[PDB]
Design a binder for these strands. Structure first.
Ligand SMILES: Nc1ncnc2c1ncn2[C@@H]1O[C@H](COP(=O)(O)OP(=O)(O)OP(=O)(O)O)[C@@H](O)[C@H]1O
Ligand SMILES: [Mg+2]
Lengths: 86, 201
DNA sequence: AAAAAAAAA
């Protein structure tokens, strides 16, 4: 319902067949059973790359909070290289 | 346009539908003029659909199944006319396709005996009937396209090509082009083909 | 004359 959003988000499960392309997605932020950072969606779940993430200041980024994730998928492994989070 | 990939197969079909000219010589007898193409591959790789498309788009073609045919009845038959009371030859499946193209499915499942009936046609493009007092040579200058499955359920790329194909080399040497197709699993191709097939439906 | 089922090799 936001005024700005009328770019469109993409479900997690639709990230399997594409790579080297930017995407926007949101979901629950938490830790997997292995111990890495993952995002959850009703469609599915992916992993998170944090090494080059610039977050929007003014928020308490805590596990269990919905976050808008922008980054580039990589099908070489399963790492979603996030470039910003808000 | 509804078949994804197989571009070289499409080019081969295009060149086969309008193949080269036949040659005749006062001393060299006769030279074959057209092209025959055989394809082998693991199941569910869109061979029969391409065969049906070639049937639909050709000027003249006849559909034939390996299991549902008999070689002796494929070329000619002996039938007694009810009016004249005499027996006359009835044209077989391949004779009707003179100057046309014949498509055969389940070729590797087709009986070995009748295979020789095909080889004769591949030899001089003429069938000879000598039975019940009729001695005639019938012209059949058609091209044949066939698709067959390997001996195993799926193609083994690590094995001898002769090992994977049940047909003897004697007739395999006749075909000008041999094509082997495999459905290699790749997520990019899987997504592309899934999008295409969903678009078609 | 040509297709289809049965028992023995
Ligand atoms: N590249 C493709 N584009 C579109 N449809 C395809 C493609 N590959 C396979 N198919 C689909 O696969 C299905 C299998 O078709 P078909 O039986 O004719 O294939 P085949 O490779 O000839 O298989 P078989 O060995 O069983 O005869 C079809 O419904 C066809 O639409
Ligand atoms: Mg098929």
């Amino acid at each position: 319902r936001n005024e700005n959003f009328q770019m469109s988000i993409t479900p997690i499960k639709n990230l399997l067949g594409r790579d080297a392309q930017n995407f926007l997605l949101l979901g629950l932020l938490n830790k997997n059973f292995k111990g890495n950072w993952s995002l959850e969606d009703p469609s599915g779940s992916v992993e998170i790359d944090i090494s080059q993430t610039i977050p929007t200041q003014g928020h308490y980024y805590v596990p269990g909070c919905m976050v808008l994730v922008e980054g580039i998928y990589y099908s070489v492994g399963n790492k979603f290289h996030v470039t910003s989070m808000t | 346009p509804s078949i994804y990939g197989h571009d070289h197969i499409k080019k081969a079909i295009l060149l086969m539908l309008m193949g080269g000219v036949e040659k005749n010589l006062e001393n060299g007898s006769h030279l074959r003029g057209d092209i025959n193409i055989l394809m082998v591959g693991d199941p569910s790789t869109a061979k029969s659909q391409l065969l049906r498309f070639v049937l639909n788009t050709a000027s003249l073609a006849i559909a034939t199944t390996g299991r549902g045919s008999s070689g002796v009845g494929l070329t000619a038959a002996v039938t007694t006319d009810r009016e004249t009371g005499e027996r006359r030859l009835e044209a077989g499946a391949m004779v009707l396709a003179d100057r046309g193209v014949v498509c055969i499915d389940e070729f590797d499942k087709m009986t070995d005996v009748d295979r020789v009936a095909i080889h004769e046609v591949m030899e001089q493009q003429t069938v000879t009937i000598a039975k019940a007092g009729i001695h005639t040579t019938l012209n059949a200058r058609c091209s044949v396209i066939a698709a067959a499955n390997p001996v195993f359920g799926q193609y083994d790329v690590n094995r001898d090509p002769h090992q994977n194909i049940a047909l003897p080399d004697s007739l395999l040497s006749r075909f000008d082009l041999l094509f082997v197709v495999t459905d290699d699993i790749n997520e990019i191709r899987d997504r592309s083909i899934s999008e295409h097939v969903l678009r078609t439906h």
